[PDB]
Predict the 3D structure of the following.
Amino acid sequence: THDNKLQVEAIKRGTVIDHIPAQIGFKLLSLFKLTETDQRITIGLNLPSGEMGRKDLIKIENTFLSEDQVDQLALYAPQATVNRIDNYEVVGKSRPSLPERIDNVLVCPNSNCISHAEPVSSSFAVRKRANDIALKCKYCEKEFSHNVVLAN
Amino acid sequence: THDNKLQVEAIKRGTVIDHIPAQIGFKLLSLFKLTETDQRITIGLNLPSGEMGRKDLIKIENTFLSEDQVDQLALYAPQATVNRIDNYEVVGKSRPSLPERIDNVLVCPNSNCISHAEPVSSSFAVRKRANDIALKCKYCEKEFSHNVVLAN
Amino acid sequence: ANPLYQKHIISINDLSRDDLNLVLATAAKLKANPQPELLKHKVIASCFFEASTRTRLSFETSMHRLGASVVGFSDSANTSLGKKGETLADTISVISTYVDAIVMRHPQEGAARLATEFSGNVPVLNAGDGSNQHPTQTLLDLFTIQETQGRLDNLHVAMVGDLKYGRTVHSLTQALAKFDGNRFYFIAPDALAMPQYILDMLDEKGIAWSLHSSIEEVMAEVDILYMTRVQKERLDPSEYANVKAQFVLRASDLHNAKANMKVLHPLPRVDEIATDVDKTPHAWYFQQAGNGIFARQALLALVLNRDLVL
Amino acid sequence: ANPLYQKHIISINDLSRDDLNLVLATAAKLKANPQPELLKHKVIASCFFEASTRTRLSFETSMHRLGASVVGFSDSANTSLGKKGETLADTISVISTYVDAIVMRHPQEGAARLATEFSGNVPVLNAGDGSNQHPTQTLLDLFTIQETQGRLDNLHVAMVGDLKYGRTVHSLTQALAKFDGNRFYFIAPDALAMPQYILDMLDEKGIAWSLHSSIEEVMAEVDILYMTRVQKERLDPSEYANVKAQFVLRASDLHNAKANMKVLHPLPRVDEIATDVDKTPHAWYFQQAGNGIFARQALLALVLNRDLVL
Amino acid sequence: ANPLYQKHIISINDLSRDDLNLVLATAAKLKANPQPELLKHKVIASCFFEASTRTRLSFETSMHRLGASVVGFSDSANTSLGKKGETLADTISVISTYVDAIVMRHPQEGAARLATEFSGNVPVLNAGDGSNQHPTQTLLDLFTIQETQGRLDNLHVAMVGDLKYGRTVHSLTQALAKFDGNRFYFIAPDALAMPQYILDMLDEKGIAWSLHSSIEEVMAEVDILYMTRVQKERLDPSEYANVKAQFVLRASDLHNAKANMKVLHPLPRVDEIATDVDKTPHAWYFQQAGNGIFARQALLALVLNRDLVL
Amino acid sequence: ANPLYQKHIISINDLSRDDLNLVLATAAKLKANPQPELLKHKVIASCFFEASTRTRLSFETSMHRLGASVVGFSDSANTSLGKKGETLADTISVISTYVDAIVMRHPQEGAARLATEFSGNVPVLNAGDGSNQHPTQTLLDLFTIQETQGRLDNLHVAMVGDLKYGRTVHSLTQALAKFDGNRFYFIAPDALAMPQYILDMLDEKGIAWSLHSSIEEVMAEVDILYMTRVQKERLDPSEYANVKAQFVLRASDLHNAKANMKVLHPLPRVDEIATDVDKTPHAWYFQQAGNGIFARQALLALVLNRDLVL
Ligand SMILES: Nc1ccn([C@@H]2O[C@H](COP(=O)(O)OP(=O)(O)OP(=O)(O)O)[C@@H](O)[C@H]2O)c(=O)n1
Ligand SMILES: Nc1ccn([C@@H]2O[C@H](COP(=O)(O)OP(=O)(O)OP(=O)(O)O)[C@@H](O)[C@H]2O)c(=O)n1
Ligand SMILES: O=C(CP(=O)(O)O)Nc1cc(NC(=O)CP(=O)(O)O)cc(C(=O)O)c1
Ligand SMILES: O=C(CP(=O)(O)O)Nc1cc(NC(=O)CP(=O)(O)O)cc(C(=O)O)c1
Ligand SMILES: O=C(CP(=O)(O)O)Nc1cc(NC(=O)CP(=O)(O)O)cc(C(=O)O)c1
Ligand SMILES: O=C(CP(=O)(O)O)Nc1cc(NC(=O)CP(=O)(O)O)cc(C(=O)O)c1
Ligand SMILES: [Zn+2]
Ligand SMILES: [Zn+2]
């Protein structure tokens, strides 16, 4: 990120989710179970920035993401920027592109979906609307505003 | 001492939970809702050591813990120590001894216990039976082995 | 004797404003200075042809707070009294030979009024008849509003939820439509919107009402926020989920809530009011359930006691 | 006021020995010299979320023996109060606005303690919460033992039956573990043996206990023989048949029974105590049920009456 | 290698126009020339987790019309296998090891879809999942619409009743909205209007539709008058009392009906279609039901057969 | 003239080693080469006096796999024929005059055995009688054990769960205790231990067995890990709360499992086997279920056929 004095270092063969909103950081570690490994991961919840001020920052080392795994980040930091990196150099830096689907992480607001009690990882069809994202469940086939799906 | 190899650089007065066993650092962030805050929060897991080898380690920049908070961690992070550091100088090393009352982060393994559906927080009476810590449900008054309550 | 003496409380429409005030007043007298033997020796019938634990418990406690005796029944698998499918009338016709007053709850609209044409000289108080009335509930709601606002006129009253079906809602609205200056805000899903028959009645009496899809739209201006329970069956699950937010309160939604705003709810609340709302000073649903005791006491006192002292 | 005044009786573990003796003492006072208007004007809630006719009848009779009023419910198909699946808390939260004390029975362990964190200032007495406690039962058992033995110390107490699951058993044992010199004899099938958690507690307090597979093994030395009901479902039928004998009393098994031995049983007895045991002088299960009236009276008196005269 | 061979049958949304046709073509072939031993040796599970006589018997009958065997069950007094608890996944992983294809009905949306994730190579046909789909009798409605109109394009379709909740109209409409020329008429009170996600999809496809209040204002140009039931138990009694006589069809309302006009109803009809309409030539509901045998047959013959000699 | 021809199938105790083999041999022949018209023209009663979906459908499916017809019933909301009262004897003397063989399940031990005393010449196959026998799925467990291990001798068998009450483990154990070399591992809390009448019979036959507390201390030498369910509704909640995580299997506990090791479970599993084990190669429970079709088939083909062309 921008600013470096008494901060963290850098890596060699790992990704760096930079520019992630405040509070949404930890959640991204939860929703996607990233800490669930042995790779040296480092976080920066509430960091110094230029435009957005305090952005959380995760740098899981020796771990790579696809153009899609990055797009799973899409709903929780459209601004963010995944940083593939090697030899201390940003080999490539991708951005959250809206996905065509979202599996495992989202829960079906349809209390009557067979999805719940059952041993199946959820799944929705994605489609941007004028002001939001429409998510359609693979099971009950009911569509919901992402504002309601992600809604607790 | 270790962080002065690939300089993540330690910081001044405050509390830095360190010597947590890897894979048990996301937990405390989660369980004790530690990332719910704003003070310069930095996190590093799967690090190096010796007899442990690895370790998680949260750093809560300037802001202290209770003597007991030092304890609630005792069930999860035994061999570890919160640093009552007063500006770079690691002065005040608090080592969490087993707490006698756990509240909120534990779940009563009794599927019939009143606690589950209702708006109350769990709470158990700690004791080290055979030394394997036997926790008593404030509610059902049933006693289980800490290794039964923790599982799920 | 007093205006309501030996009268019948079937509808919130057969009651005037003097009437209501008369009930609240008495309900305040009794709260401050209780008369535990006012109905000593009277026997009351708590007939709940339809099950309602919270109302039955309340009414019966109001019955024992004046020293009156009690007998009754509940949701019998096969209609109570007669014991075979005999008519409601033959039922009331008998119990009225035993008691001094009848409190009843029936699943059919107009049940209290029909009993009325049979209780002989016996006063019958309606505790609920199908989706029609439920006067005692409105009384305690008005008693709870008037106590905490000091009045029942020029009030900013917002009503949220199943405005379409809630009988207490239609009723409170009609009662408040007896006082002046009241302003209503109605927040509910158009599939559960406030019936026209009511907006039409408010239109006539010249009262101001407006529709809102969100609580925060008027939270700013409300004195009393009266929430309803959107009986989960009233909707298709996925439908429910998508409208759920429209009608649920939390503590954070309270930030710009007036100092005097009390949050009422006829109960049960469980899917509408987050438990964190509980510890806020606005929450008043339990204090509200508490006032059903003084409202029901007041009602019984007046009706069974001739020259009610105060 | 008295030590137990406005206190809560949730567990037989939250009670001390002064406490207990205090309850028995009062229970003896009232038995000899009754005060029928001691709770005149108080209203008590007999809430039996779980059905228990014999305890409800008893408690309510103790409630009317002091002149107190009563309201309540029983095993409602769909949880009582709230009337839709609202939380136990929202239930207690309301009833507590109506009553002066709450007696409740719930099928979930810890139900009385949770209500306690909601009854406001209202005393709640636990009549039974799942397989956890049931204090009033132990009180009448201790009151029945202390009355007929003249004491509660150095007693030869034999317990027979479903020692593994019976909550009254675990509880009486813990209470008697508050007095000195007690010696326990436990007769039950190892599949239904007395939990270690208890033998471990008796081990600590230094109390003598021994295991026996037959009643006649100690009939010789027992003062009180406390039988349990081996809920017939706890076992596979053929299993039950083969262990049945281990735990059943008859008059002939009494031959070498001490003069002072009373045969107690929390009831129902029906598959454990032959009816011929009835007419023997040892039989005391009915006198025992009789003392639940004075125990429950004592409990209510203390708790709802400040300066309890005696 | 047949298009629908070994393919699951879950949502109308998954069946392309040509799919619909292969089914309706194959259908008529089977009704012209029955292949009774076609599925001889094949065992099929008729699992109705949500009892539904009419559909099940129509389905099972179809199965026997092609020579197959049937094992199955109805209602789920229980939990849906697992002696209570067991996931729908396990009860399908199992069953799928016995039969050659599963026909299922379930009270929860998604059910069949999950199913197909556990039956491995066994085709799963949905006979109704909660309020989601019912591919089955819609492939038969369609079959009926084409058998009598000769086509599924350039048709005038009116739909009456519970359009908001009728899961069969939503499907039929989505189904016909795959062919061209069709014009829709929606006659339902404001309370049960055809949802907007159906109307959007229509406008988005250049398909004409319009709302009407009386059958009479469209009876002259209607080819198919498709009546849905009124989920009565779902409304208020007085409300449905109203919204009835308006959307009830009588033989006299048929005076100006087109010569080729047919009346359809997924069944059962009790209030909606008067009995004096049965005898008029437009009455086609029972003939439509009978057609469920041929649609259900084609579907099975197609899914379980590589190439059909037809 | 086939050994099992026209012979009843009631207890594992009645089937000799060669009997087991003829069934398991004939089984595999039928799974290799199905004889679909083998029992054509034969009618079979599928009488489940104690509903049991999974077993019944597996059984009935088997019947249809050999060409037979089925009439029958499930659950006994009633009394077991007699419009209430009628003895099981009369309802069998009758049925036996219609069908060619009776398949029965009953809640009482002895049921099938009595049955055979009244069906005259009609073979009675027991599909489970109370807590006594279930010959049927044990002939399929065995079939599964041999299909995957290639043998029923010199095996290492571990058994987990409710061993005291699992009527299927008792049978399996008695069944395997007829072949030689087998070694048993019993992993169950002290509360549900494998009874001693099973262990005696073992010691009395020079068959090795041993008790263990963790699957891990035997996972390396286990050929068949046979999991039984935990009759949860049978225990105390807190007790089963404990005795769980200890006897629950997870895919990770499989790290050192032998290459040929298989996991079995009579089904249903909900707590006992984690869902992440299904995907590992040892998971064989659903394949074992599917094998019930072949064991059940052989049994019918053998009992109803003099000499089988196989
Ligand atoms: N060895 C490295 C290399 C890169 N990064 C991170 O990768 C991102 C690269 O962004 P940077 O080159 O520092 O430019 P900025 O000014 O931060 O703006 P931008 O985020 O748009 O790149 C930053 O989060 C930087 O900290 C890192 O932590 N360690
Ligand atoms: N301002 C500071 C000071 C210390 N630390 C952390 O405190 C830990 C322990 O420091 P200390 O006990 O003073 O010396 P160590 O050599 O680390 O002790 P040990 O050998 O037990 O790890 C170190 O890992 C260091 O990173 C920190 O994060 N910030
Ligand atoms: O209001 C009461 C008891 P009370 O007079 O508040 O002590 N009971 C009552 C009211 C109401 N009032 C409503 O407005 C319906 P809601 O509770 O969903 O808001 C409904 C029911 C019911 O069981 O359907 C029961
Ligand atoms: O003891 C009472 C009534 P009480 O306090 O003696 O007037 N009821 C009670 C106690 C107990 N006490 C037991 O110890 C069980 P048991 O009656 O089988 O010995 C059980 C039940 C039950 O319904 O399961 C009910
Ligand atoms: O057609 C039937 C006869 P059934 O009563 O299910 O045996 N049922 C059915 C069909 C449908 N809808 C259809 O379109 C099938 P149809 O064309 O047979 O009417 C819906 C339902 C429902 O429960 O919502 C039920
Ligand atoms: O196998 C089944 C399937 P089902 O639920 O009876 O349809 N049931 C069954 C088997 C068995 N035991 C067996 O060994 C048969 P299996 O090998 O199929 O598990 C016991 C019981 C019981 O009720 O105790 C029930
Ligand atoms: Zn869904
Ligand atoms: Zn508990």
About this structure: Strands of chain C lie at 43-48, 69-73, 101-106, 124-129, 156-160, 183-187, 208-212, 224-227, 262-264. The first strand of chain C starts at residue 43 and ends at 48. The two ends of chain C are 12 Å apart (CA to CA).
